[PDB]
Amino acid sequence: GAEFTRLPVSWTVNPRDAANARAAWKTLSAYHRGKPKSSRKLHVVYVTFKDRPALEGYRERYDHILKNIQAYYADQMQANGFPPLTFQLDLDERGKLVIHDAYVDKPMSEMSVQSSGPVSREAARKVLASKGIDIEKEHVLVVCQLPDGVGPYYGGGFSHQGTGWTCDQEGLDPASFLDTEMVTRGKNATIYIGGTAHELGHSFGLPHTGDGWNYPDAGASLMGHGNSTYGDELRHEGKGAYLAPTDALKLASVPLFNGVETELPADASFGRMLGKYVPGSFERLEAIPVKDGLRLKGRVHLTRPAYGIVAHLDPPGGSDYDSNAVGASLDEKGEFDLTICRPGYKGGFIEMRVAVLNCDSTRSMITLPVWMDA
Amino acid sequence: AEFTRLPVSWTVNPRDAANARAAWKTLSAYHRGKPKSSRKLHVVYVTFKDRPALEGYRERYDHILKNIQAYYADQMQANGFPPLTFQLDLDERGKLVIHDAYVDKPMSEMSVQSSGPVSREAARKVLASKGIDIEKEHVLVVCQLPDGVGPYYGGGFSHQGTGWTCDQEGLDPASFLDTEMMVTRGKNATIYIGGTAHELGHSFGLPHTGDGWNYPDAGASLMGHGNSTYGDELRHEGKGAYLAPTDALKLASVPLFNGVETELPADASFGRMLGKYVPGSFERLEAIPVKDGLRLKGRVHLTRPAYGIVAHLDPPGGSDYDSNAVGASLDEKGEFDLTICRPGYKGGFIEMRVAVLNCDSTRSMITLPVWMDA
Amino acid sequence: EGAEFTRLPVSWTVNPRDAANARAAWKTLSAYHRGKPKSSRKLHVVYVTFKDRPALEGYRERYDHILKNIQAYYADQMQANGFPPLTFQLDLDERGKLVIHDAYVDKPMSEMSVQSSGPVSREAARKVLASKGIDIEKEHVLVVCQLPDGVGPYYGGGFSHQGTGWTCDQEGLDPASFLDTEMTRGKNATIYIGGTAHELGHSFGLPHTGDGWNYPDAGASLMGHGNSTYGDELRHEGKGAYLAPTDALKLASVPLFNGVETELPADASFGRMLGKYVPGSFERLEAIPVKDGLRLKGRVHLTRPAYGIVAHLDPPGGSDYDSNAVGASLDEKGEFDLTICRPGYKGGFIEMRVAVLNCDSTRSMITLPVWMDA
Amino acid sequence: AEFTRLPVSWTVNPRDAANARAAWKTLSAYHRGKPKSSRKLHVVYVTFKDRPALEGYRERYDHILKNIQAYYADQMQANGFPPLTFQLDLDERGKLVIHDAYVDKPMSEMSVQSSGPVSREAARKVLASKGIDIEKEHVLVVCQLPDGVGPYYGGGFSHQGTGWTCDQEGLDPASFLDTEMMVTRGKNATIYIGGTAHELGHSFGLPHTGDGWNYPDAGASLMGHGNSTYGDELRHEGKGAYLAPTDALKLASVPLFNGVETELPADASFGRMLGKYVPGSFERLEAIPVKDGLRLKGRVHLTRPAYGIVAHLDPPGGSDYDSNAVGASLDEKGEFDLTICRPGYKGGFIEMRVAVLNCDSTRSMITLPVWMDA
Ligand SMILES: [Ca+2]
Ligand SMILES: [Ca+2]
Ligand SMILES: [Ca+2]
Ligand SMILES: [Ca+2]
Ligand code: NA
Ligand code: NA
Ligand code: NA
Ligand code: NA
Ligand code: NA
Ligand code: NA
Ligand code: NA
Ligand code: NA
Ligand code: NA
Ligand code: NA
Ligand code: NA
Ligand code: NA
Ligand SMILES: [Zn+2]
Ligand SMILES: [Zn+2]
Ligand SMILES: [Zn+2]
Ligand SMILES: [Zn+2]
């Protein structure tokens, strides 16, 4: 992996999470029996503008960037107990990343942070459509040749479609992760390449999941603030970013990751959190208090095959960045049993989200208002 | 007997009477030292340009209002509370005071959509002339309008509400005994006076509560379809309308009923169901399945003094008319334990609403999606 | 022709402005369809029997008549509106007769309810259709149930690219009965076959559109209360059911109707009304009062190709059954100009919905609160 | 001068002053015959187990509260209104009355999530000791807590509100002049006292209103980011903070400011923006595009007396901090005419909020999606 500065795995999964991943993968693998295989890829578009020509080495640099994130997701999913699942890239005969070029005949003065997303997305749609790729049904990364004050840094999508936006900078490459010269030059690469890994997670349907007591020496959760520590373990003794078991549970049912072209149900709907959702119900639901935590057990009514369940604790304020999450697998009857803790929590009230993970890639969510103390 | 006082045609289950006594003890402790209320249910009679008042309306609605007043008093007592009910504004002869309001529009200039707002505005002006603010009181607005033009509606909460009805020739609770045909004349009075008693319940903040397995021989729940059986026990062979124990629990914290002028909290807000609501939370919540039922137990976190909790089971479709409810009291720590059943239910999915009753007249509600079978 | 399935006549004449709108909308849609794949979609039919509920006699021939009657109706009504005779295609065998998939549910009627018959029959339809390679989650389907009233489902729900309609069979139900004045009854056949045509409109994404001043002698709008007058002509002074021009405009972008397999955008989302929606905006928007009406003109900002616009006037109460609608086409710049009236309206307040019709089958909707008088 | 009174460092545009004069004439007629208000903004100082009161807090917060009081008065007057501001509870010496409350919890048992509710509960009990109901008054809760634990928040509406802030050693408006470092001491005092003035605006029901093209040399709008420039004149660092004309219009109907005890209507409800709202409707509404702007004119249907109207332009993202607003008065028929601009805007889509200001202190709001260019 050294050619694209492959990141190491700087954490060890808890045995309960590894057992959850193996059971979820067994349930998903049975569901995948007999279904068509997926040929989906994460496509990359580079968008230039009238006074904004392409930056040097962008084809080689983004071959390194995408392959670094690709290997990262692969290595992190494996560290969680899944196979090394990750998105595939469109590669040329030499194994280098295919990059679609798009140009927008507008000067930067006619652009804004509000319009750079839609304008670059339309440009990406046109060039991708010319090669038979529908941006409305695929996962795409849109790279903009724009500066921070105008260009977009955003990610949004779900299991069957998503778009991520980023901006290129001169010499941006994962090889800079080791450079401690000059705010440092590794931290700069950490911010933007880690941000892209984070925004791509959103395009796969992942919300925010912050750090939790069960992983104090694992680095920062990628979907929390791990976008600021991605690859920082290669300099100055840092802890890096790890993919939370709950996020690995969610990605396991994404066709782009599991290589199986499952079909979405007609009632799959957007919700307040990222992803697509369907109605669910409980035959049994129990929230039992413990010291600085909660034991959540019950029985999901299986209207459809489902493989797992994810509980989030979310203090009021600060969006979902300060949340922590715990995963669990569902047996053949839909029963689950997990404990989620917040040691030393003094906020009293806290929001609990409960998300059932369906094999058809949708989710079912309920929200419960909980009081927690010692 | 002068206003044809209705009998009490049902017996409360012992557990519900014990809940009412425990709830009344909690409310009485909360009421210690608070100012007493002088609130009344005010009555306005609205005429229109070509629509003069019907004969005997002052005597007839003196009978109607005292009949509904005595019913609520008798039903609250049958539930285990004191005979709580709304007070009336009476003149020196002990007769109901009725404010006359006039709308300078012919009946042809009216509609079912505008009759409500227009008559309410006319009621505001006449009530303001006597120093009574319609925006902070409970009022019954009687319109001299025929069916299909006039309003029959009720809406409000614990500290304000308005009920709308239309007068008809000879409408009097004495007609409950009349078996002559006009639908007989007793059934007609049952429909209209029962509708007023039902819609007045809405003005107090009550949603719909249909009939339940725990009361098969009590008549029809007033807030279900008991508006069509109110007072029908006085003829033929009918079971009348009874005030559901869960509705009695909610009304006990209404100042108009308990005679105590408590203050509403600043965050009291309207919701999907009638009434005003504030946030709540649970320290423990358990929904345990039983045959054709569910046991709901847990511990409410008491951010404020609270006296009871009401669970509703509501099959999809048909609004909340087909719901059934079970009440329970809260101890000093917020603990509750109830069981709610739906015998023979084959619908599978059923909605469960859980409403904590706060002493400050607000409620805290959650909704859970539940699967139920045998 | 069409006498074999008792083809209905066209008992109304479109207003010239609406036919001109339809032609402009079809020109815009036709340009958008250039180069897009052709559609092979069909309206599939499933017949579900139960343990003590065997199939009724002649159901294969009767529903060949029923489905072909509704098919010819939509074709004739779309043509009467100024479009080509657009309609759904059916799956026919070598003899040209309707294909009906047989499904059996091994459950007695005592194991059914009005809440579960819908979902249970859908699951049975899913299993049998999958056996023939038909995914119920990506097609329009009619599920015919061998269940009686009060237990069986009568429902329609869906959008442009998927939908399901539910109905129940009754002995001898056939469109030939439209002429029968005995008692079977003609009104009986009108109600059930008209309900199916109406509910199929829901499955295509249509909400309710009641009758309007601009069509007083056209019969009852199918999506209003026309389900109760469908085919009531050919029986004495009946005026039938007509397809509102606004409903014809909406169906013209449905692949099942226009035969073009357009792709839905990723952000297509469900809303408060039936159909799928995307964000939109206006460059200019003017609501000018007229006597008992409103002039609505402006300029839609074209984020995507759009062909038409539909305005709804909806008095409060009574759901959207009492609404009236007016259509208008969009020029190449997004300009529109329409007038919508409600003569003699006395409600004062009225809700106005404005829905831009996109060529990709989605819509964009805003709601405005309007006061209207003479 | 004793409390370092701020100057007026901006001049209102003539059209806005005429709007204020017209709005105040309309409000004054509505106030005729209504009872006078004796409301005051009460101040509570909350200490904790290991957090004793800081030195001189009574004199320092007498200076802080009178400074904000004089600020609102001078700014309301500079806007064209009378010098409206909140009244304070003063002792015999004319010094601010500060209620002392104690929380029996060490700082280690506190958090940013609980500091608000816990200190609010402590303030409720002590204010109740003097007959002041926190649920029906405006209160400022000053906490003896450090940053990261203590609360800085404001929330409320016209008839009730609560502001939260934290005390710091030596915090006094006299520090506005100090240019020594701590990052200077005037900037520190500006942030904390400006935050309090800003959060108190939220407690009065004001959302965010950022800066606009019509006031480029007036400083920063208080309800935008003016909390960070409050008092910047007194040390020649910048132009300070000014009260936007749209905010002055909203505050003019607040009893705490106008001294008239008007009654809130029963249907006053919270919404997505701060304040309480009632339904409204338009007889005419026109949004006419101009170069880099929009002309908004029409006729509000007056269901109740209304005095003004406020338009917000809000680009997507960044919350409402980057919005700009324009005010306009309503004549006796509800007619209004304003123009709101965003020069050089390149984002295309922009959100427009339209808020009718009712004399009973509530508002009526609609939201329109607008496309804007040159
Ligand atoms: Ca949070
Ligand atoms: Ca129901
Ligand atoms: Ca309606
Ligand atoms: Ca914004
Ligand atoms: Na390691
Ligand atoms: Na640059
Ligand atoms: Na570093
Ligand atoms: Na970034
Ligand atoms: Na009459
Ligand atoms: Na009877
Ligand atoms: Na059991
Ligand atoms: Na019949
Ligand atoms: Na007939
Ligand atoms: Na959706
Ligand atoms: Na919508
Ligand atoms: Na601050
Ligand atoms: Zn993020
Ligand atoms: Zn009702
Ligand atoms: Zn319908
Ligand atoms: Zn703020």
Numbering used by the authors:
A (entry chain B): 19 to 200, 208 to 399
B (entry chain A), D (entry chain D): 20 to 201, 208 to 399
C (entry chain C): 18 to 200, 209 to 399
What does the literature reporting this entry say, word for word?
The uncharacterized protein AMUC_1438 is encoded by a gene that was previously shown to be upregulated when the bacterium is grown on mucin. Here, we provide structural and functional support for the assignment of AMUC_1438 as a unique O-glycopeptidase with mucin-degrading capacity. Structural, kinetic, and mutagenic analyses point to a metzincin metalloprotease catalytic motif but with an active site that specifically recognizes a GalNAc residue α-linked to serine or threonine (i.e., the Tn-antigen). The enzyme catalyzes hydrolysis of the bond immediately N-terminal to the glycosylated residue.
The core fold of the protein comprises a five-stranded β-sheet with a single α-helix packed on one face and region of multiple α-helices on the other face of the β-sheet. Pressed against this α-helical region is a β-sandwich domain comprising opposing four-stranded and three-stranded antiparallel β-sheets. Bound to the β-sandwich domain was a metal ion that was modeled as a calcium atom. A central feature of this catalytically active O-glycopeptidase fold is an ∼30 Å long helix that contains the HEXXH portion of the zinc-binding motif where the glutamate is the catalytic residue. The third histidine residue outside the canonical metallopeptidase motif, H233, completes the zinc-binding motif and is found on a loop structurally adjacent to the α-helix supporting the rest of the catalytic machinery. Underlying this is the “met-turn,” which places a methionine side chain directly beneath the zinc-binding site. Together, these features identify the catalytic center as having a metzincin motif. Overall, this fold is the same as that described for OgpA, the most structurally similar protein to ALT (RMSD of 2.1 Å, amino acid sequence identity of 19% over 292 aligned residues) and whose structure was described in detail previously. However, two tyrosine residues in ALT, Y171 and Y217, were structurally conserved with a phenylalanine and a tryptophan in OgpA, both of which are structurally implicated in glycan recognition in the G′ subsites of OgpA.
